[PDB]
Amino acid sequence: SSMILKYPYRVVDTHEKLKEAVTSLQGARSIALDIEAFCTTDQAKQLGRISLVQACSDAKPVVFLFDVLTLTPDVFVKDMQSLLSDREIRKLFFDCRRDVEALSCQLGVKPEGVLDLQVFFTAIQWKLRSVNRRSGMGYVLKSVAGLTRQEGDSAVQTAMTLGNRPVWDIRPLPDHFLEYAAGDVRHILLLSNYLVGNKDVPVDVVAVERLTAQYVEHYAVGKPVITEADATPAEVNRAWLERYIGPGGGCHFCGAKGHTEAECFKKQNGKAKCSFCGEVGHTARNCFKKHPQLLTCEKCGQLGHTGTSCFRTNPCKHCGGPHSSANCHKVI
Ligand SMILES: Nc1nc2c(ncn2[C@@H]2O[C@H](COP(=O)(O)O)[C@@H](O)[C@H]2O)c(=O)[nH]1
Ligand SMILES: Nc1nc2c(ncn2[C@@H]2O[C@H](COP(=O)(O)O)[C@@H](O)[C@H]2O)c(=O)[nH]1
Ligand SMILES: [Mn+2]
Ligand SMILES: [Mn+2]
Ligand SMILES: [Mn+2]
Ligand SMILES: [Mn+2]
Ligand SMILES: [Mn+2]
Ligand SMILES: [Mn+2]
Ligand SMILES: [Zn+2]
Ligand SMILES: [Zn+2]
Ligand SMILES: [Zn+2]
Ligand SMILES: [Zn+2]
Ligand SMILES: [Zn+2]
Ligand SMILES: [Zn+2]
């Protein structure tokens, strides 16, 4: 469960350690994947030189950080490509577009059995509301598992937002660099426990597998991708969503796309609300405070209150004391 967040990382930077890592991963049924690369000075959308490939599987409580820079891609691909090509081992990404491009351009591999969970989350939004926006990991984690992505406030994350520096070319990598890189794959695997194999999720995993497969075909072409599959970087192709996920949903109460019945303001406003006692749920014509005759009492025979409320709550007419007005010693 949330034990995933406590998986230690392990730097894989030698051939011995690489072979040991591959052994573990090969028994996996799912492997979360992510890539850290040199930042680019330019305006190209392509990831820079691959530095780390991070992997976290359900086969071992450990995050492997493959130092692809030290190992070299040739060493790394020779041991990893069969596993990356194994469609019986699910590969979990969070937004796979540029990562898959880099795997294709820089490593010459194209993964199989890929499932993009950002695309999964948007698929759920599309089915329920006809929303095709991509959400960041921060938003999705907080929304699905109530956790705060605190790595977005870390020094590493700001160093890239500045963009002045490759960042990921330093060797040896500082501890908070590695811990930062481990968190991304930890979040991906943790997230898959909420989305994959959950009967309360309104989209079939296989359908999102088929939609993701379109993204991999579009982005793994051995060259940089000039034409993007989506109209803007932060959304998912609506025609693909329509083909693979189905017609987009909307509000069964008012009719509008963009929200569900449970979010509809028109439902919560048009609700019956009492002009006399303020309570929501009844009009004033049926209010018990305004018309106490609608309540005969179970234990005393007075109109206005049930059995669950036969106590005297209003203080004395005469002195304000803890009793009723008729029995005040000033009038009696
Ligand atoms: N220049 C720049 N590069 C980024 C930024 N965010 C991510 N990247 C690049 O994308 C890679 C993967 O980041 P991720 O998609 O795993 O968050 C990083 O290693 C880095 O190369 C950013 O805000 N600015
Ligand atoms: N590579 C890349 N992805 C982006 C960019 N802007 C938005 N995204 C996508 O949208 C997600 C975050 O959404 P946003 O924070 O932009 O609403 C990112 O994780 C990524 O999948 C961008 O400029 N470059
Ligand atoms: Mn990534
Ligand atoms: Mn970023
Ligand atoms: Mn990352
Ligand atoms: Mn509205
Ligand atoms: Mn009431
Ligand atoms: Mn009335
Ligand atoms: Zn080897
Ligand atoms: Zn984390
Ligand atoms: Zn509505
Ligand atoms: Zn009322
Ligand atoms: Zn009573
Ligand atoms: Zn009194």
Automatic annotation (TrEMBL):
Residues noted as binding Zn(2+) 1 in the record, renumbered to the chain: H15, K19, D79
Residues the entry annotates as binding CMP: H259, E263, C264, F265, K266
Amino acids binding Mn(2+) 1: D34, E36, D184
Binding, GMP 1: E36, A37
GO MF term list: 3'-5'-RNA exonuclease activity; nucleic acid binding; nucleotide binding; zinc ion binding
Stored InterPro entries: 3'-5'_exonuclease_dom, piRNA_biogenesis_EXD1, RNaseH-like_sf, RNaseH_sf, Znf_CCHC, Znf_CCHC_sf
UniProt-annotated binding residues for Mn(2+) 2: D34, D99
Binding site for Zn(2+) 4: C274, C277, H282, C287
GO cellular component entries: kinetoplast; mitochondrion; PET complex
Residues covered by the CCHC-type domain: 273-287
Keywords from the named record: Calcium, Metal-binding, Nucleotide-binding, Zinc, Zinc-finger
Residues given in the record as Zn(2+) 5 binding sites: C297, C300, C310
Residues noted as binding UMP in the record, renumbered to the chain: G258, E263, F265
Keyword hit for Calcium: yes
Chain sites annotated for binding GMP 2: E263, F265
Chain residues that bind Zn(2+) 2: E151, H187
Binding site for Zn(2+) 6: C316, C319, H323, C328
Ligand binding (AMP): E36, A37, T161
PANTHER family: PIRNA BIOGENESIS PROTEIN EXD1
Protein name: CCHC-type domain-containing protein
Organism name: Trypanosoma brucei brucei (strain 927/4 GUTat10.1)
